[PDB]
Design a binder for this molecule. Structure first.
Ligand code: HEM
Length: 188
């Protein structure tokens, strides 16, 4: 996992559960509690997993619930640190651009393998987005979408319609519905 994202996870964990929970969790995997994570270094996926398991242990929270909360709050943490990607006007266009943004990172950044996020308009007020990953971060994905709403200041409802694993991939399709319409039909 790239330092960019893991660094935001560590800060977000602190904002949610405080410095002691985090310091101990990092110490438990052999990090300095005050480790400065750089954007382009690589962090072992399993060390992140063990860190989050420690947070779970020390907070009595299910890890999936932690990931859900981290997702929501991390949208803020991440958008503040990497603003270039979060300056658009409309949530819907942001969401539609995400598959290409991730694809560009896969292409151009060594060691980066973000998930597919193919989005598809399905109604004048809704899009379908499908998370497809070799990882499985269903709850983080859900929380991050929810965090995007608070940032663009646009109300949405997020409805999960499909979940499952096939051929090595975790897959989660959500239907994102906007209070106010965002598409109109146009002749082919
Ligand atoms: C609503 C918008 C977004 C969603 C839903 C989303 C979703 C995710 C998720 C769930 C992961 C965890 C990896 C996985 O589960 O497979 C991930 C990884 C990542 N994402 Fe995003 N993302 C969004 C926007 C962005 C933006 C704007 C950037 C700008 C650089 C970005 C950069 C990254 C990076 C660098 C990783 C780590 C990839 C790796 O370490 O292999 N994401 N994304």
């Amino acid at each position: 996992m790239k330092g960019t994202i893991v660094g935001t996870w560590i800060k977000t964990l602190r904002d949610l559960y405080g410095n002691d929970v985090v310091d101990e969790s990092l110490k438990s995997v052999g990090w300095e509690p005050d480790r400065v994570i750089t954007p382009l270094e690589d962090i072992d996926d399993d060390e992140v997993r063990r860190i989050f398991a420690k947070v779970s242990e020390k907070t009595g929270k299910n890890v999936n619930e932690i990931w859900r909360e981290v997702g929501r709050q991390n949208f803020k943490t991440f958008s503040e640190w990497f603003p270039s990607y979060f300056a658009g006007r409309r949530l819907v266009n942001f969401l539609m651009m995400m598959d290409e943004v991730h694809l560009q990172l896969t292409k151009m950044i060594k060691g980066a393998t973000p998930p597919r996020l193919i989005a598809k308009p399905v109604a004048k007020d809704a899009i379908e987005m499908e998370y497809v990953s070799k990882r499985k971060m269903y709850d983080y994905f859900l929380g991050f979408i929810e965090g995007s709403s608070k940032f663009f200041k646009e109300e949405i409802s997020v409805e999960e319609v499909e979940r499952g694993e096939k051929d090595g991939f975790s897959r989660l399709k959500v239907r994102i519905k906007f209070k106010n319409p965002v598409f109109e039909y146009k002749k082919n």
